Point group: D2
Chain length 352, copies 4
């Protein structure tokens, strides 16, 4: 039924999200069980620090979950792009837990980084889609994310499944804390609702197709504004627009600079702002106000029912269900996957 | 004086500010660094779980620019945080953290809020600050005043190079008990000695940069800066300067990870991916501007801005200077009053 | 009604034990709250290691509780005699939590050690009986054990009270652990019963006076055998007999040497063996057997109902109630306090 | 020309001390190189703490060297008796470096402790005499102490050889420190002289035989007083007197609350002086192990002196133990005990 494997894979996300969780979460009793990390959790916690290492969209899934790993575990977590980690020859030691995230399990820079960590005596953990791939075999332990084969040229379902697996890993690490139990239960109940909420978000495709057929087609760049949990989503949206749509895109930390890119943009530059409640900071509102003050006409991804910009000012809304704060990225990325897909179609590009 | 603007003056002041930052703190003959503010705190800093560097804007750049040398010389985990994002994530900190705050003014709101957060959590706090007795200077437990003198220009020029130098001295101080580091120490200190005179030499690129800025470069809507490794910070800081001073969009891009283009191709950061990126550009006849070491031919049409070769971890101090001059002259050519 | 303050203090222990716990343990909800440490616990929970530092009987209360601190917290715990700590110039750093235990809060070696740790930037915690004593003032935080004044020349109720305060501190450090919950509850329900069980143990006094009068008064030395939880009890009993009674005494790790002191003993040298269930190791049984075979007749401290040796093989029994393993030393020490006291008074030695 | 393997083994110590160092110390350039640990040191240096785990005399060699490890490395070091470590079910984790010291490499409690540590993911290092014994094989890395086979029933040369191997291990761990370079050179130059100093100490044998011919040999107990570096020597002396001489003995922390007191300069604390003064106040006739030429007790109190050469403070125990080995041996002979 689908024009392309990429469209199929985006639309497959209710099912891949469920498949990632299948057999791993008891939603009734709120227990996460990751069999691959079985005899290893008590060791993983006993480390100086967690280093998340990955490339491209897999690196963004690490950015998207860093905060919740930090929050739930109180272990320091850093996130490294594999090639830059290697370029810096960043010291790694026996007391580090190195977490490698990869859809393919074959990316050269990820494998080189893994070899570097292994030879230095670090504990290694893989979060990998392709079962038995190099990264899966070579990591000490890990989780196969169970998204199924990905044939689109860019990662869609693997991103949402990686993010979910990383959240389950964070929950697993913090499963002995009385003080975390309410937070755990909140997040696990939220996860249970993700697959159906993804289905809801997919109903935005018509509005997106329309927007992609608009003046948007002709524009040469698109800027995405995000802060907090949604900065990763802004970076991933930009990567998608670049890798798939062959259009220039940058993810911008919203409102960080008063006199940055937003003071420079043309009236008609496409700007997407993430304004869901989890990441609705004063600086986000300032950035959005700055755009509208200059007569810009931004596209706002926000929660159902929220009016971020007055009806008096021209702007586009793409409304998404509200979920638990640290899970909102799973829903907010979907319109970007669809926008990047339909822009590439509007332009004649093959995405498989 | 001879200077059109405060910003131009402060750019040209860098041989002196770089010297002043080192003054009384480095014995170049015996290769000994002595930072009076940190003296009795070093043993405590050396034993922490991790160092978190926390800063905004150009000061965040100076942390990125020196992250690798801290890691290399100390083998302590070092992370670099933008103050607002650190606060947005509510990143946990604890007694065993050493939090290093870098700020020219010592008054930036987000940096102060971040310091107060770390203090309340019981972390050890260290300031690298220009303004003596500012909030950040007072409220950190210990620190180094960078001694760059007052900064009047709207964007940081001398404060970036002086912060970077102060951070390198801090890294050297932390690792001054290591026999295996001694050769690397001496190399960096002998390098630092020559920085002020090398900065004088790089400032002689101004006329070449004026010629470049008189061209259609000054009419462009975007300028991309490509760098990797030590020079990625320099790419980010060049981008920030072009945005903040020249009012032109600019982006610092990690070279070859995935319109005028500036590429950093000095030897310290001349990776395969940089060469690949540069090849991609020349293949489409892109005409890149290449910042490279004196005498190197990185490309067989392009513009070359040659800079003296220094110790790898110090190359960013010389590479940033043409970007400061480009952002300044682009602004002048576009009729912007930089002050 | 007491002959000496020391006797009064020994008999005061049901009340001092209760007074130490008062306002600090919710026995129904199994919650421990130590006001003086409350705001400091997350900091202590985080350190590289705990160093317990003390002199004499206070040093023994640290040995008596070292295992339960290690078990409940999984933080390394070492136990230092203050003078030897200072003699070795053991390095201490900002990441150490140094726990100082002292009845008087004034002992020179403990104060010197505290000053050394403070100057090195370590976090310091006091467990002290004398409110506002030097050690109470100078530590960063602490617990006043609330045992009341001791006038006896040797510590009795302050030993049991210190030991209880130390167990409460360990419970407080581990009060966020789901996996520890059952063990927590076990110990707290145990602590609730300690004051009445001490009342029960104190009923051994007449049998102990008989034993001193029939078998011990004329003696020049006595050996205490103990292992595991009861090794500290054996050392403290030895100290009491030395300090109070002016008789030689040695605490011996039971069955450690096949040809050590037990291979050398007479059949009339008095030997006390701790054989309560919590510390009834094979090596303890072997030691006892090495004694009865040599025709030594050991004095066996054991749980009510237990027959450790044959009635065929001659021995004296002092039965004590069974409590939780890590609490059994609180009851096992009491017969030793009473023995040392009666030995002293039967020799016209003042104990106050 | 020896009566027993024990006596031979005591007298072999100049050679065993030399053999333990052979090929591992460059005394000219002051460099220690332990082949067995080469590429493991950077990892050993990166642990939360070091736990030294051993039984009997090997436990004492750990006590004897704890201070120098802590001094030189600034890593926390604890010393555990293997059986008690197991009795407590002491938690250990991936970030622990567990160091096992054993002459035989077969002692049951040390083996069980090793297996417990290995199961918990700890890094394990062996300091072992018997090449290819269980503990030699099962530790991740280690140093064979190269003392030669030990046939005496109690450890004599293995103690001084284990102690020297442990000091070399601490030197190796700290070989990157500029601030400790002077202390390193001092210890290494001191190690060079230990073999010939042990020869010197063995010349006390005749004085010791005279002492053991006295009514010392029909005593029921002998107390040994020591503090600091010499507390381990007092504990090891007491063990030797119990295991060999069949006489009760206790090693006592001097001044904490027949007498041999260690009063060498490395461990001449006020509390040691005060303890000795208590004995001479009662005209108790102590036996004093002290450095050559030091008068610890004046001649108006009766006492016996056993002078030993002064070495570097942390090495003094290597010499101070030798008279106790000889005392335990000659007491047994005078008591008709076959020490073998
Ligand atoms: C593919 C596979 O055999 N998975 C089985 C596993 O699923 P389960 O979900 O338990 O395990 P995973 O597929 O996640 O992991 C399989 C194994 O590979 C390791 N690993 C995985 C990813 C990685 O990047 N690195 C790595 O080392 C894990 O530690 C584990 O040993 O147990 C279930 C039985 O209950 C079965 O339904 C599955 O057939
Ligand atoms: C400010 C001051 O009087 N500096 C004097 C100091 O310079 P010196 O270079 O020794 O000290 P700095 O100016 O770097 O620092 C001064 C004090 O401020 C603290 N600190 C500094 C920066 C910071 O951000 N946070 C912070 O706490 C330092 O720990 C130190 O206690 O001795 C010199 C002579 O030896 C004098 O010429 C300088 O006038
Ligand atoms: C002295 C005081 O007013 N104590 C009150 C406190 O007891 P609470 O049991 O809370 O506190 P403690 O008496 O144990 O400690 C008093 C203070 O002294 C500090 N400290 C204590 C011991 C030590 O060795 N070092 C040290 O620094 C503590 O951190 C605390 O700040 O609240 C109780 C009600 O809950 C009152 O009944 C107590 O009268
Ligand atoms: C046993 C052996 O062949 N040793 C050789 C080794 O001595 P060298 O002194 O290098 O090594 P050791 O004999 O100390 O140790 C041999 C090996 O056993 C390991 N180990 C040792 C003891 C222990 O308790 N646990 C443990 O794992 C070491 O890590 C090493 O891998 O190189 C020398 C050549 O330069 C040879 O003269 C020695 O014959
Ligand atoms: O997740 P993987 O298989 O390690 O691949 C990482 C990245 O590899 C390349 O950079 C791809 O173009 C990206 O789309 C992909 O995300
Ligand atoms: O270094 P400081 O005083 O904390 O200021 C940080 C940043 O603050 C502001 O953004 C300035 O415009 C920047 O130029 C500056 O780099
Ligand atoms: O517990 P405190 O006050 O520090 O005293 C410690 C020790 O000090 C001295 O050693 C006393 O004789 C002991 O009985 C006492 O236990
Ligand atoms: O050093 P090993 O072979 O582990 O032996 C440890 C102890 O084992 C036994 O206790 C021996 O009797 C002691 O002499 C010895 O010291
Ligand atoms: Na694997
Ligand atoms: Na300050
Ligand atoms: Na206090
Ligand atoms: Na081995």
């Amino acid at each position: 039924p689908y024009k392309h494997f990429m469209q199929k894979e985006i639309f497959e996300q209710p099912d891949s999200a469920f498949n990632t969780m299948r057999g791993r979460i008891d939603f009734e009793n709120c227990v996460v069980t990751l069999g691959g990390l079985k005899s290893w959790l008590s060791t993983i916690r006993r480390c100086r620090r967690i280093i998340m290492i990955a490339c491209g969209t897999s690196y963004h899934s690490c950015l998207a979950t860093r905060s919740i790993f930090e929050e739930l575990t109180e272990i320091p977590v850093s996130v490294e792009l594999a090639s830059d980690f290697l370029d810096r020859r960043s010291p790694v030691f026996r007391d580090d837990t190195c977490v490698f995230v990869s859809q393919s399990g074959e990316t050269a820079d990820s494998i080189l980084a893994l070899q570097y960590c292994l030879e230095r005596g670090a504990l290694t953990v893989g979060i990998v889609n392709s079962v038995g791939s190099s990264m899966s075999r070579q990591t000490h332990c890990g989780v196969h994310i169970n998204a199924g084969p990905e044939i689109g040229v860019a990662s869609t379902k693997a991103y949402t499944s990686q993010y979910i697996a990383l959240v389950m890993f964070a929950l697993s690490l913090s499963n002995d804390s009385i003080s975390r139990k309410g937070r755990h239960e909140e997040i696990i109940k939220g996860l249970q609702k993700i697959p159906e909420q993804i289905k809801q978000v997919l109903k935005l495709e018509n509005k997106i197709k329309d927007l992609c057929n608009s003046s948007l087609n002709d524009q040469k760049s698109l800027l995405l504004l995000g802060r907090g949990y949604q900065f990763a989503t802004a970076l991933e949206g930009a990567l998608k627009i670049k890798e798939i749509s062959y259009m220039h895109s940058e993810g911008v930390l919203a409102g960080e600079l008063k006199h940055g890119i937003l003071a420079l943009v043309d009236e008609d530059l496409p700007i997407i702002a993430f304004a869901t409640r989890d990441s609705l900071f004063p600086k986000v509102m300032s950035a959005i106000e700055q755009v509208t003050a200059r007569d810009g006409r931004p596209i706002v991804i926000c929660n159902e029912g929220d009016a971020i910009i007055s009806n008096d000012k021209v702007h586009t809304t793409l409304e998404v269900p509200e979920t638990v704060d640290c899970l909102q990225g799973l829903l907010n990325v979907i319109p970007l996957q669809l926008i990047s897909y339909w822009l590439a179609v509007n332009r004649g590009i093959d995405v498989d």
